[PDB]
Design a binder for this molecule. Structure first.
Ligand SMILES: Cc1cc2nc3c(=O)[nH]c(=O)nc-3n(C[C@H](O)[C@H](O)[C@H](O)COP(=O)(O)O)c2cc1C
Ligand SMILES: Cc1cc2nc3c(=O)[nH]c(=O)nc-3n(C[C@H](O)[C@H](O)[C@H](O)COP(=O)(O)O)c2cc1C
Ligand SMILES: [Zn+2]
Ligand SMILES: [Zn+2]
Ligand SMILES: [Zn+2]
Lengths: 212, 210
């Protein structure tokens, strides 16, 4: 089965004033021109859809599920939603993450999302040596990130680009080694034309690559 | 002179939590050693209002930049965010308590970071950015983790919780940073983890109260 999952981590969701949403929408345009009829596309909007965070209730529920105790109606409701998010994630073999860079790390709701999809025995497992990803079946990820600064000049900025470093480390771990990030970078330093034209060109290439 | 405890544990107060036990041991030692004229404040991220960056916040910020009028909702959220910022700026000693969930800081702790990293307030675009909190402030992070992160292996390379916090607080001008790793809760006996962690926070308490 061929399914593409769009993980939209932008707080504005669909507002085209945003650089990363424009770039994504241009990606989506090219991608749909090129995919098969056998290819489904799903999207989760992290700032619009319900994405449960790890809280007392979730930790309590996960404790009980280890003992085999009964869950309260609240624990059932939140664990069920988290199961839907996990299974939706495992159901896809192409992923597109869209995010603005805010304070050198992933958006908080994207952290909640990671907390839903990094699940022992589901996307990774523990081993004698340590732990190992379970999603090693040729999946592909494209990250689209807009940023005010430039992160490819190998300087202090590069060193604190934790958003990219974390996402690549996490997904590489789960088994996704075909990874590309498109950085619509330098929005605070470069001509809007230059930033956008370069990011449109890059996601056009990505669409072509991902559609084969 | 004020100490600010930033509690990023979703369980808040539950002593089944290793990071909370270690914090409470720290706090009890600290309270014994500090002076009368010293205030301790605490914000519990999972039991308080810490605005996340959403549509409303972003729009409020754009309107503040265009000199446009704010809606009541935009007003209310930005007022709460400036209250959090000022509470953060008001303190010279900080304690962050967190469990390690998925190799990064808790999501509410990122929200908190988004409230306190503010231009012209805790840093300034300037030639480069510089921190405004360069007045000898101290930062203690108490972190509980299943794994061990001090062996200089793969685990060390993905400990983004510590790496991020240290980089952000250095950037704000807070260079006196110390992390207490109550680590190995997935491999060592719980009493073994606690004994070492308790000694670290007892020395931290003494050093910070001095
Ligand atoms: C609250 C906030 C925090 C930001 N933090 C960073 C940052 O840490 N590094 C950076 O390069 N740009 C930062 N920026 C600039 C944004 O990344 C830049 O405006 C980007 O174009 C936003 O993407 P978008 O247009 O899709 O929303 C920040 C902007 C805001 C509003
Ligand atoms: C959802 C979840 C994610 C976790 N992720 C990590 C991890 O990425 N690295 C690690 O060393 N331990 C991880 N752990 C183990 C916890 O860090 C460990 O249990 C720690 O003791 C929890 O802190 P606490 O006792 O203060 O709640 C995770 C635990 C849970 C429940
Ligand atoms: Zn287009
Ligand atoms: Zn309470
Ligand atoms: Zn024992």
């Amino acid at each position: 089965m061929n399914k593409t999952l769009i993980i939209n981590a932008h707080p504005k969701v669909d507002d085209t004033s945003s650089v990363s949403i424009k770039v994504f929408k241009h990606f989506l345009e090219s991608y749909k021109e090129l995919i098969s009829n056998n290819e489904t596309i799903e999207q989760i909007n992290l700032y619009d859809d319900v994405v449960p965070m790890i809280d007392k209730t979730v930790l309590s529920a996960w404790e009980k599920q280890g003992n085999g105790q009964e869950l309260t109606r609240e624990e059932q409701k939140v664990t069920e939603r988290m199961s839907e998010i996990l299974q939706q994630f495992k159901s896809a073999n192409t992923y597109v993450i869209v995010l603005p860079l805010h304070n050198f790390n992933i958006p908080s709701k994207l952290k909640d999302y990671m907390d839903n999809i990094m699940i022992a025995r589901e996307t990774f497992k523990y081993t004698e040596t340590g732990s190992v990803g379970l999603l090693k079946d040729g999946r592909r990820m494209l990250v689209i990130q807009a940023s005010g600064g430039i992160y490819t000049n190998d300087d202090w900025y590069t060193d604190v680009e934790y958003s990219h470093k974390y996402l690549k480390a996490m997904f590489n771990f789960l088994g996704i080694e075909d990874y590309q990030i498109v950085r619509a970078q330098g929005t605070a330093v470069l001509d809007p034309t230059e930033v956008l034209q370069n990011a449109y060109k890059e996601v056009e290439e990505a669409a072509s690559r991902l559609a084969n």
